[PDB]
Design a protein around this ligand. Structure first.
Ligand SMILES: *[C@@H]1O[C@H](CO)[C@@H](O[C@@H]2O[C@H](CO)[C@@H](O)[C@H](O)[C@H]2NC(C)=O)[C@H](O)[C@H]1NC(C)=O
Ligand SMILES: *[C@@H]1O[C@H](CO)[C@@H](O[C@@H]2O[C@H](CO)[C@@H](O)[C@H](O)[C@H]2NC(C)=O)[C@H](O)[C@H]1NC(C)=O
Ligand SMILES: [Cl-]
Ligand SMILES: [Cu+2]
Ligand SMILES: [Cu+2]
Ligand SMILES: [Cu+2]
Ligand SMILES: [Cu+2]
Length: 497
């Protein structure tokens, strides 16, 4: 069952075996993935997070981010450790109390301390729209239509050896899948449909790293939502989904009653489907309980291409229709060397005092904010353009901006910008060498907003900056509760800082 919008959420350690290999994990709600948090557009969420963690190998502190929610006036509840809060210490709790005006769609939540979400603290977050403009396109939209894609590691995140390549051990679809090596025939997830019905499938990448080529044998998929933004209908037969992205698609259960493979091929780790890796099962009601016998095509006829997506609403693009046609045009120099990422020559290392607290304490320009060189001020009520030219090792990098969604004026693998009707989203692949993926947004949300690669291993290696949007108005716009004010002193005491 779905929980929320007002709920407790316990964070605990437990052993799990989603691919037949047992290891300890960091879990929300006792499960991997965590339980779906849900409500309606405009609701007040009050998620009281109880930190009950005791195993230091996966960190006993935590902080939770509500990915894609704008947090306007509630920057303190956004979750990124050392940006908007100090972590919650073990044996304590914290009420993330916020509202979701003007948003409806598919989101997710995850730890935002170190690489802890990789150890299991990840789950779906759905904001339903009682007056959804896409409602007539489908018959079913509920917990049974959520599809999560996750990477899973046998080695604990904190224990990944310095200097060795990090790859996953399994792909998990709805929490189940088979290991790439020493594959055993552990249970696969089943997604059940009834012949003739239409389903709003909510596809959520909760990945720490790989992108997936997602498809369903025999079926096609009509995209209706991108990262919370309603789209015009776009029919595709494969979706390349990057870490932290979401799509909703209509699945028409219009094939013969049977079993069909659901495929999610990561860009690293096990290649193909031998032994049922990278797989789940779409089962029609009345089908035999047995594995599918279907195959994929050699070549997909209609893969998703991002420039084919367009908003359902007339969203346009802010600013003027040319490069640099913004109030604050930025071009970030994104680089990697010697194990560390950098943005404009600075590798991100989290500060001791959270950025928001530094601002509330009176730091009022970005040159006064720590970490030095990692915080960039943005002016209020302005059009911002950010160019994110690719080339840094480890790509393609899915960049994500907190506090905002943005127009994707230029997408991967295509040198032509779109100043008319590009999709808006919150996580975008910056592509490959020579690309110039570029985003635009307007600054109407005061506070410090993280911008980073959502490959969690790259964030940990410094691939981030903070946009301190409207520093002068941050304090007035974001009143803080006493419980938030108490986080830093409690954390610093517990850690002898
Ligand atoms: C990506 O686009 C940005 C503009 O959005 C380009 O930035 C220009 O860079 C040149 C030097 O390369 C400067 O002289 C300009 O001041 C920049 N701003 C402009 C033209 O608006 C950037 O070069 C592009 N990068 C790639 C790799 O194509
Ligand atoms: C590369 O991106 C451009 C810009 O988004 C795409 O160009 C648009 O193509 C559509 C469909 O033909 C036209 O309606 C638009 O007028 C084009 N816009 C512009 C600014 O050119 C283009 O299709 C993409 N290339 C590929 C191969 O998908
Ligand atoms: Cl966000
Ligand atoms: Cu996220
Ligand atoms: Cu986010
Ligand atoms: Cu990256
Ligand atoms: Cu983040």
């Amino acid at each position: 069952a779905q929980i929320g919008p007002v709920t407790d959420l316990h964070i605990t350690n437990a052993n799990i075996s989603p691919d037949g290999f047992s290891r300890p994990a960091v879990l929300a709600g006792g499960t991997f993935p965590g339980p779906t948090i849900a409500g309606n557009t405009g609701d007040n969420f009050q998620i009281t997070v109880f930190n009950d963690l005791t195993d230091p190998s996966m960190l006993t502190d935590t902080s939770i981010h509500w990915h894609g929610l704008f947090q306007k006036g509630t920057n303190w509840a956004d979750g990124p450790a050392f940006v908007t809060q100090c972590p919650i210490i073990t044996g304590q709790s914290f009420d993330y109390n916020f509202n979701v005006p003007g948003q409806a769609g598919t989101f997710w939540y995850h730890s935002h301390l170190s690489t802890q979400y990789c150890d299991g603290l990840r789950g779906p977050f759905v904001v339903y729209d009682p007056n959804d403009p896409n409602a007539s396109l489908y018959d079913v939209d509920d917990d049974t239509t959520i599809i999560t894609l996750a990477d899973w590691y046998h080695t604990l995140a904190q224990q990944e050896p310095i200097g060795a390549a990090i790859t996953a051990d399994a792909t998990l679809i709805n929490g189940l899948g088979r290991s790439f090596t020493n594959t055993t025939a552990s249970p696969l997830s089943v997604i059940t449909v009834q012949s003739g019905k239409r389903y709003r499938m909510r596809l959520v990448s909760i990945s720490c790293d790989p992108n997936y080529l997602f498809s369903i044998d025999g079926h096609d998929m009509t995209i209706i939502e991108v990262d919370g933004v309603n789209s015009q209908q776009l029919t595709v037969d494969q979706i390349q989904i990057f870490a932290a992205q979401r799509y909703s698609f209509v699945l028409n259960a219009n094939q013969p009653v049977g079993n069909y493979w659901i495929r999610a091929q990561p860009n690293s780790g096990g290649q193909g489907f031998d032994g049922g890796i990278n797989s789940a099962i779409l089962r029609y009601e009345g089908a035999t309980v047995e594995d599918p016998t279907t195959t994929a095509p050699t070549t997909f006829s209609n893969p998703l291409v991002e420039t084919d997506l367009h908003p359902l609403a007339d969203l346009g693009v802010p600013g003027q229709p040319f490069r640099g046609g913004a109030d604050d045009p930025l071009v970030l120099n994104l680089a990697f060397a010697n194990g560390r990422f950098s943005i404009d020559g600075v590798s991100f290392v989290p500060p001791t005092v959270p950025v928001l607290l530094q601002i509330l304490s009176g730091a009022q320009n970005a040159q006064d904010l720590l970490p030095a060189g990692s915080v960039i001020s943005l002016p209020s009520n302005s059009v911002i353009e950010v160019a994110l030219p690719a080339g840094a090792a480890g790509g393609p990098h899915p960049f994500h901006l907190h506090g905002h969604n943005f127009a994707v004026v230029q997408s991967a693998n295509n040198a032509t910008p779109n100043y008319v009707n590009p999709i808006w989203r919150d996580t975008v692949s910056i592509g490959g060498t020579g690309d110039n993926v570029t985003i635009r947004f307007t600054t109407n949300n005061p506070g410090p907003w993280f911008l980073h690669c959502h490959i969690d291993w790259h964030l940990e290696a410094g691939f981030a900056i903070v946009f301190a949007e409207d520093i002068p108005d941050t304090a007035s716009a974001n009143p803080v509760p006493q419980a938030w004010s108490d986080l830093c002193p409690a954390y610093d005491q517990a850690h002898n800082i």
